[PDB]
């Protein structure tokens, strides 16, 4: 957007208050992404906060010419993927409707869970999902096809 870039320009030059506008605009989207990846309110608010704090810390690193949301999503996706993997116990060795959906979202491997949440909950394009995950448009299409198939096994009986 025009507005957000202008807010970013203020942030870079010393204006910390102008970041609040960036948080308000994206708070609901980012928290929703982490909550539907993790399925737990406490870790969701935590990782959603960390994403915004990390976004501020690294704001000078952000290329002004690219899209900011794509950047911010990448940060949030990498925090939640990392947490999902941490939970897996062997990591360091080497009838309410939407809660039922939610628990079924968590039975998908993180590489299919990500694309399903971004495509079907957050309504992004394949091109933007690729950018966020740093994979070709082809590969994201394939992951969605697999996610839809994994999702079908879980949700058909609801």
């Amino acid at each position: 957007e025009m507005m957000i870039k202008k807010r970013i320009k203020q942030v870079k030059k010393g204006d910390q208050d102008a970041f609040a506008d960036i948080v308000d605009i994206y708070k609901d989207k980012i928290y929703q992404l982490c909550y539907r990846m993790l399925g737990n309110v406490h870790e969701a608010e935590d990782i959603a906060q960390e994403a915004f704090i990390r976004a501020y810390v690294n704001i000078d690193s952000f290329d002004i010419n690219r899209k900011f949301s794509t950047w911010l999503y990448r940060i949030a996706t990498n925090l939640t993927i990392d947490r999902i993997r941490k939970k897996k116990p062997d990591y360091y060795l080497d009838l309410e409707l939407s809660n039922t959906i939610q628990q079924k979202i968590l039975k998908l491997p993180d590489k299919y869970r990500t694309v399903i949440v971004l495509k079907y909950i957050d309504e992004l394009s394949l091109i933007e999902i690729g950018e966020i995950l740093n994979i070709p448009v082809g590969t994201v299409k394939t992951r969605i096809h697999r996610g839809r198939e994994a999702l079908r096994k879980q949700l058909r009986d609801l």
């Binding site: 948080v23 708070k27 928290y31 929703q32 608010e45 079907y120 909950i121 096809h145 079908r152 058909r156």
Partner: protein
């Protein structure tokens, strides 16, 4: 049963299907109770995960982020 057909089911759902390929897919679903059922089960599942786009950030989320900043 062409093993090709699920690739057609997926191109449809991508919004990507060819006009030619759409007619072929429609013809097979009509004469195949197992490929309607498969395609009906994905559409249902999609519909059900779309009904979970209602999440919003907790109270005072912004205020919490701003205090945590350096």
């Amino acid at each position: 049963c062409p093993e090709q057909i699920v690739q057609l089911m997926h191109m449809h759902l991508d919004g990507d299907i060819l006009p030619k390929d759409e007619h072929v897919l429609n013809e097979h679903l009509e004469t195949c109770e197992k490929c309607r059922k498969h395609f009906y089960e994905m559409e249902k599942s999609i519909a059900l995960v779309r009904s979970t786009s209602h999440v919003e950030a907790p109270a005072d989320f912004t205020a919490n982020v701003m205090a945590k900043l350096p």
